[PDB]
């Protein structure tokens, strides 16, 4: 019959291979992702705490420059970058960690759920590194973290943390240890 | 499929409208406006999906159901109370001469025998009304602007206006002109 292109066949066969092999638990834990509602709540908070784009940064710096020509507190933003976020988790500064599920060299993030479990930081696996990228004005973002916030929504952050630790961490608690996949049947 | 947050949001809007209706019904309906009768254009905007019975009755008495409908309304005590009831859905204020003139010259239609025709001829409007003193379109223009006894029949004659949806263009007294300017 008709012939499919080669890279499309590679994509679909990589699908079937990654879903129907006996996957180790460290990799099989990434198939369990946040629901729609909890991801929406988390992204509402993280959209409240987005960083500034280049245009806003230059605009603000021009404003301070002309104010000097003619007082501030510490800025609170979503923290990103893999090594930076790992350093924040290790020093117990991060409060909530959101890890993308489609990092192509998956070794860069396999130790991250275990690390968050060890240091005690609440974590959740989200659908899409491109979603985390839009939040930080980049194309993609392997992981984001929130450490501290402004006063007016601290309670909200706390509730969100409790939400994931009641809504994602205990639904993952038993299946985070088990091998995934298989063709038994 | 409809989610629970929609249900709770709906209920919160309905409850807030219920207390607001009780507040306006209990309090004596006197606006901070002189007792002289005025004229205001009223254009209703999308807001709350579910309409309480008294607001939908007032909107039906003021014939505003379809998308982006506008009607001129007198200002006396009863009409002030009526428009204060339906404040969150309508936007009102004093129009200008060029506003009503352009608005009726671009979009002026008539209702007779339960059907809606465009204003095509002055003979059509003279066959439609006949004998109350109106003789042309400029006649009902200055009948709308300058006050007179022939408001009710002329307002019942005119279909209300289906203004085109804008692309980005409380109470105010003069910004309504820019609104209908961008609404047309």
């Amino acid at each position: 019959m008709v012939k499919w292109p080669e890279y499309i066949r590679l994509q679909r066969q990589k699908k079937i291979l990654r879903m129907r092999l006996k996957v180790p638990p460290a990799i099989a834990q990434f198939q369990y992702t946040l629901d729609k509602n909890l991801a929406a709540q988390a992204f509402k908070l993280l959209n409240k705490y987005r960083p500034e784009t280049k245009q806003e940064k230059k605009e603000r710096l021009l404003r301070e420059a002309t104010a000097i020509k003619e007082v501030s507190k510490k800025p609170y933003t979503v923290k990103y970058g893999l090594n930076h976020v790992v350093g924040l988790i290790e020093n117990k500064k991060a409060s909530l960690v959101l890890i993308a599920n489609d990092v192509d060299p998956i070794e860069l993030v396999v130790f991250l759920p275990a690390l968050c479990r060890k240091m005690g930081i609440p974590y959740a696996i989200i659908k899409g590194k491109a979603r985390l990228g839009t939040l930080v004005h980049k194309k993609t973002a392997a992981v984001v973290a929130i450490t501290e916030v402004r006063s007016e929504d601290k309670n909200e952050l706390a509730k969100l943390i409790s939400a994931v630790k009641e809504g994602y961490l205990e639904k993952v608690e038993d299946t985070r240890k088990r091998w995934g996949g298989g063709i038994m049947g | 499929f409809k989610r629970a947050e929609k249900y709770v949001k709906e209920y919160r809007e309905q409850e807030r409208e219920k207390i607001r209706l009780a507040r306006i019904a209990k309090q004596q309906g006197s606006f901070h406006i002189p007792a002289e009768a005025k004229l205001v254009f009223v254009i209703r905007i999308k807001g709350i999906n579910k309409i309480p019975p008294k607001p939908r009755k007032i909107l039906q008495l003021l014939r505003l159901r379809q998308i982006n409908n506008g009607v001129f309304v007198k200002v006396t005590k009863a009409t002030a109370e009526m428009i204060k009831i339906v404040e969150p859905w309508v936007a009102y204020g004093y129009p200008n001469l060029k506003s009503v003139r352009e608005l009726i010259y671009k979009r002026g239609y008539g209702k007779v025998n339960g059907q809606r025709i465009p204003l095509t001829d002055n003979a059509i409007i003279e066959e439609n009304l006949g004998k109350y003193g109106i003789i042309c379109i400029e006649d009902l223009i200055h009948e709308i602007f300058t006050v007179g006894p022939n408001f009710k029949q002329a307002a019942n004659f005119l279909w209300p206006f289906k203004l085109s949806n804008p692309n980005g263009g409380g109470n105010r007294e003069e910004h309504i002109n820019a609104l209908i300017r961008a609404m047309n």
Partner: peptide, 22 residues
């Protein structure tokens, strides 16, 4: 009867969890 109720409940659960759009 029971199968229709189970299918409707599963469809509603999928709409609640994974959403409706796409």
């Amino acid at each position: 009867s029971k199968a229709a109720k189970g299918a409707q409940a599963k469809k509603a659960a999928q709409a609640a969890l994974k959403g409706v759009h796409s």
